[PDB]
Amino acid sequence: VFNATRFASVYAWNRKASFSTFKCYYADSFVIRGDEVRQIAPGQTGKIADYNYKLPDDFTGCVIAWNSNNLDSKKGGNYNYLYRLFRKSKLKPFERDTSMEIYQAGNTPCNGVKGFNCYFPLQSYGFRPTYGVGYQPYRVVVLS
Amino acid sequence: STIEEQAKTFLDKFNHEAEDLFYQSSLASWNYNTNITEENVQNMNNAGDKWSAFLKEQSTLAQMYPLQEIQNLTVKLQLQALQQNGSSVLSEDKSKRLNTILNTMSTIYSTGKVCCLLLEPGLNEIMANSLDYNERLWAWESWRSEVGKQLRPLYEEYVVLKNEMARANHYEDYGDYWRGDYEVNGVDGYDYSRGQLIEDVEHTFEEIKPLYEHLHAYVRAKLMNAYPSYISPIGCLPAHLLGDMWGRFWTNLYSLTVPFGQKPNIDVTDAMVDQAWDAQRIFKEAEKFFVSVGLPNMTQGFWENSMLTDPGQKAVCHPTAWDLGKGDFRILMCTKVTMDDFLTAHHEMGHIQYDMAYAAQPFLLRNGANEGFHEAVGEIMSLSAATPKHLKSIGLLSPDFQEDNETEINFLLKQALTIVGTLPFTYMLEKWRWMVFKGEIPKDQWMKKWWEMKREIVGVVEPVPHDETYCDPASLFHVSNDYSFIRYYTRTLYQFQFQEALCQAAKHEGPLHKCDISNSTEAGQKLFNMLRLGKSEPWTLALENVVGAKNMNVRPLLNYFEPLFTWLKDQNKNSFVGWSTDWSPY
Numbered sequence: 006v007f008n009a010t011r012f013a014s015v016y017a018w019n020r021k022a023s024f025s026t027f028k029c030y031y032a033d034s035f036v037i038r039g040d041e042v043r044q045i046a047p048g049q050t051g052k053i054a055d056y057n058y059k060l061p062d063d064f065t066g067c068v069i070a071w072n073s074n075n076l077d078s079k080k081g082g083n084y085n086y087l088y089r090l091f092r093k094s095k096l097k098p099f100e101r102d103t104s105m106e107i108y109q110a111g112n113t114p115c116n117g118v119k120g121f122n123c124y125f126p127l128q129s130y131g132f133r134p135t136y137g138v139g140y141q142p143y144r145v146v147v148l149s
Numbered sequence: 150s151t152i153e154e155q156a157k158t159f160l161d162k163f164n165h166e167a168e169d170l171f172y173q174s175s176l177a178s179w180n181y182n183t184n185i186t187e188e189n190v191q192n193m194n195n196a197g198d199k200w201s202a203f204l205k206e207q208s209t210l211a212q213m214y215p216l217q218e219i220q221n222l223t224v225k226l227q228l229q230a231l232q233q234n235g236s237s238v239l240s241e242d243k244s245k246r247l248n249t250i251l252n253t254m255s256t257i258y259s260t261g262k263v264c265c266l267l268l269e270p271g272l273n274e275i276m277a278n279s280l281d282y283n284e285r286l287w288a289w290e291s292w293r294s295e296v297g298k299q300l301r302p303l304y305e306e307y308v309v310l311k312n313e314m315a316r317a318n319h320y321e322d323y324g325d326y327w328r329g330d331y332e333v334n335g336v337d338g339y340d341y342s343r344g345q346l347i348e349d350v351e352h353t354f355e356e357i358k359p360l361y362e363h364l365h366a367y368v369r370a371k372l373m374n375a376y377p378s379y380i381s382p383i384g385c386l387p388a389h390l391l392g393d394m395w396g397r398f399w400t401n402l403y404s405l406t407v408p409f410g411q412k413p414n415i416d417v418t419d420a421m422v423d424q425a426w427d428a429q430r431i432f433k434e435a436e437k438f439f440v441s442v443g444l445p446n447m448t449q450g451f452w453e454n455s456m457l458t459d460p461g462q463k464a465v466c467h468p469t470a471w472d473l474g475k476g477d478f479r480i481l482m483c484t485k486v487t488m489d490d491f492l493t494a495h496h497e498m499g500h501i502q503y504d505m506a507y508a509a510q511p512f513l514l515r516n517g518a519n520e521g522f523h524e525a526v527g528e529i530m531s532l533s534a535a536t537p538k539h540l541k542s543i544g545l546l547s548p549d550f551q552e553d554n555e556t557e558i559n560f561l562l563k564q565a566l567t568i569v570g571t572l573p574f575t576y577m578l579e580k581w582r583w584m585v586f587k588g589e590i591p592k593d594q595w596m597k598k599w600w601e602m603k604r605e606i607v608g609v610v611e612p613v614p615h616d617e618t619y620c621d622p623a624s625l626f627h628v629s630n631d632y633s634f635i636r637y638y639t640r641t642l643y644q645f646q647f648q649e650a651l652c653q654a655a656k657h658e659g660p661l662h663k664c665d666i667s668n669s670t671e672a673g674q675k676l677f678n679m680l681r682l683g684k685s686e687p688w689t690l691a692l693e694n695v696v697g698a699k700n701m702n703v704r705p706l707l708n709y710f711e712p713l714f715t716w717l718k719d720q721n722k723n724s725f726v727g728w729s730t731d732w733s734p735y
């Protein structure tokens with residue numbers, strides 16, 4: 006869906022002109038940051054390609070991405086878009102993780118509550134129109 | 150799981166939260182500055198309080214990772230940056246007392262008046278413009294006897310509280326705390342302690358002394374012409390006659406001490422107000438200059454969200470470069486059509502280029518290598534942009550202009566008055582403060598020693614005797630507003646080290662005072678290799694990348710002023726060079 010009015014989050018990606026990026030090598034849809042679009046490619050590494058959305062090394066589809074600063078940002082902040090920061094291990098190609106469990110980073114466990122060395126694993130982009138071009142929203146659609 | 154991995158995880162959480170909180174705080178502050186109202190002074194305080202509370206909590210819970218269990222030296226730098234206590238080590242009564250003392254000392258300064266003139270612009274126009282001995286002496290002694298006499302005992306208590314605050318942080322006094330900005334540990338070959346900065350400063354001043362002797366004697370002869378029955382040809386210079394309230398710069402003396410007065414200096418104000426230049430042409434020219442040496446353009450937000458003209462609503466028109474984070478760079482400056490705003494633009498855009506360089510380092514590693522790098526990087530651009538070759542290459546000077554050997558001495562002498570005439574002042578003031586923090590000057594001798602180190606290091610004498618109810622040093626903005634003062638010395642040396650290295654990479658033949666680094670990419674790769682590091686490396690390594698050595702040096706500063714030194718040596722052939730600490734005007 007190239008024209009829906011509301012896109013998903015990158016950790017909860019969906020499945021069913023002015024294209025800043027059209028790189029060819031189902032239709033997944035999400036929203037990420039500007040300078041993270043480079044990570045939607047085979048053999049990449051980061052937070053997005055580790056904990057949020059991974060692509061295999063032998064891929065056949067395409068990748069489309071385009072700016073969205075006039076729709077997905079507002080004066081004050083748009084805290085409705087999220088991404089996963091912590092995970093126990095990297096993903097697998099096309100896997101998906103919608104869990105919201107506390108991440109334990111030490112040796113004593115969490116009681117399911119935050120505190121010393123226990124972090125809530127999801128973090129939001131607070132999108133604004135007066136951001137740099139690398140910190141502005143970007144809508145991404147991946148084919149096949 | 151080792152205590153290092155947990156530190157890395159804690160830090161990559163901290164960075165992500167602090168970026169957002171800091172952006173919204175600084176946006177509030179900008180919105181206030183560009184449009185002063187009543188609703189905005191509150192929206193500033195809201196976000197300021199939020200950011201400060203966040204920082205306090207994160208430092209408190211960062212103190213639980215002991216540094217001895219960390220082998221990576223970047224994690225160590227950031228954890229050190231976060232594990233610092235501050236006035237949190239004192240009590241609650243002592244913290245509140247220190248804040249009350251600081252606020253009282255600031256407001257006594259900023260609203261002081263004598264009889265009905267305030268310091269700005271009342272008593273500053275009598276010090277920069279008047280030509281009367283008696284009126285200048287009146288303004289000087291009035292400012293000394295109204296404000297400082299009120300700041301003596303507050304300062305006496307300030308010293309005690311600051312010393313014990315710093316001793317509870319495992320330093321030895323507050324001067325040591327201050328010198329702790331130039332310390333490096335753990336690196337093999339690039340180490341530096343807090344007791345070696347004193348040695349370096351005192352080792353370089355011994356070589357700056359002769360040029361200052363000759364300039365002091367020249368200025369003394371000219372002032373002896375202007376104030377005939379008041380100056381002695383072998384003594385010091387009276388303190389109230391240097392075109393300044395304190396004597397920090399000797400600039401306003403130019404009109405009295407110009408070498409060849411029948412040759413006017415360069416001023417392209419008419420050549421630009423006559424071609425219809427405006428406020429945007431200046432910044433387009435500065436952008437062209439910085440692109441010529443291979444640095445990037447400006448961003449679109451810079452052109453959309455910068456205030457580059459006075460909009461008739463109030464505002465604070467002080468020139469400033471803003472780095473809000475998240476790709477947001479701005480400038481606040483109400484510029485005119487003049488030859489000094491043309492240079493301030495280059496200064497501020499040098500600040501912005503340095504900011505844009507290290508925007509990839511983690512949140513806490515985004516500054517200069519130490520406290521004297523931003524200003525040097527800004528100043529070398531104004532050095533290289535004011536060159537008659539540059540002003541002729543942009544069409545702002547006629548090709549029928551020919552440089553004159555008598556006009557290159559007026560320029561060098563003005564530069565000397567501004568730049569060299571301020572170094573003994575800085576060295577002496579910070580030496581007095583260090584010795585008072587250390588405990589080597591008792592209370593009952595403070596003013597006895599101030600006016601003993603003015604007659605020896607600076608060569609300046611006081612017109613009337615000052616007993617021990619006075620606090621003359623605290624009558625300066627930096628001393629009663631709790632700021633350090635040694636960054637100016639080190640910055641003034643670094644700027645000439647930088648400029649010599651860059652103009653040597655640009656294959657310049659001739660005197661150093663004529664060099665222009667425009668159209669040189671090899672001079673723009675050497676600067677960027679230091680700008681990109683932020684403060685992720687010891688300042689000695691970042692200094693060695695550009696220069697070739699790893700410490701301060703005074704030889705390029707003396708290479709800049711060599712023709713002036715030869716001229717002055719010939720001018721003072723039948724004079725006395727050096728002063729005697731015995732003659733006093735009373």
Ligand SMILES: *[C@@H]1O[C@H](CO)[C@@H](O)[C@H](O)[C@H]1NC(C)=O
Nearest residue numbers: 183184185186187188189462
């Ligand atoms: C200046 O501030 C006032 C309220 O503080 C606001 O109404 C006005 O629009 C502001 N000016 C501009 C140009 O936005």
Ligand SMILES: *[C@@H]1O[C@H](CO)[C@@H](O)[C@H](O)[C@H]1NC(C)=O
Nearest residue numbers: 157160220221222223224511
């Ligand atoms: C230190 O940690 C950083 C990541 O925080 C890593 O990139 C770097 O290689 C580490 N250095 C050493 C010497 O292990």
Ligand SMILES: *[C@@H]1O[C@H](CO)[C@@H](O)[C@H](O)[C@H]1NC(C)=O
Nearest residue numbers: 441538539542543665667668
């Ligand atoms: C830089 O090079 C351009 C292109 O040749 C020239 O127009 C300009 O005058 C040069 N500027 C300086 C300062 O040499």
Ligand SMILES: [Zn+2]
Nearest residue numbers: 496500524527
């Ligand atoms: Zn500056």
